[PDB]
Amino acid sequence: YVKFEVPKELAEKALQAVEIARDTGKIRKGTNETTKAVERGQAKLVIIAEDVDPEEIVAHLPPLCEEKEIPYIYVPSKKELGAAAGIEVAAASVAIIEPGKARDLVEEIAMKVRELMK
RNA sequence: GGUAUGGUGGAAGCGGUGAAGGGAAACCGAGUUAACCCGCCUAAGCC
Secondary structure (H helix, E strand, O other): OOOOOOOHHHHHHHHHHHHHHHHHOOEEEOHHHHHHHHHOOOOOEEEEEOOOOOOHHHHOHHHHHHHOOOOEEEEOOHHHHHHHOOOOOOOOEEEEOOOHHHHHHHHHHHHHHHHHOO
16 A cells, blocks of 8 residues: 655654644544545545555555545554554554644645655 | 442553444444452342
8 A cells, every 4th residue: 555655754744743733633543534534525634654464454545545635644653653643552544634733734744745756 | 128230439351453332224433341358329120
């Protein structure tokens, strides 16, 4: 499901974006909530973590992100993001719905995937 | 009358790879599951 390579520091900027968006606005976390967030177009950003077995459980979500034109990014460890998502469990995927104070920043980080193509 | 299988107070397992628990399902989306000691409140159900 890993479509494009990402910097780990940029993944960190994304993670901090998920924290700030968690506190100041609405988000969803785990594949179910987050794919449902895409399908309903509420997803303003999709955060995937690459350490996932089975791969397939996340595999369906990234194409939909380009299919519904929702930005998507990778983060090194689902555990670290689950902690960033404010839960006690590793979370393979997360979505920012309401960016909150993170909004501008996420736009900027979104720009990176715009570049990440090809 | 009495009696915790209900509840209050005190010195290891399932779980966002979706737990329990509601619900016919859709759908919810975060914590649940503890007979262990005493000492309190309660009486369905029981003698």
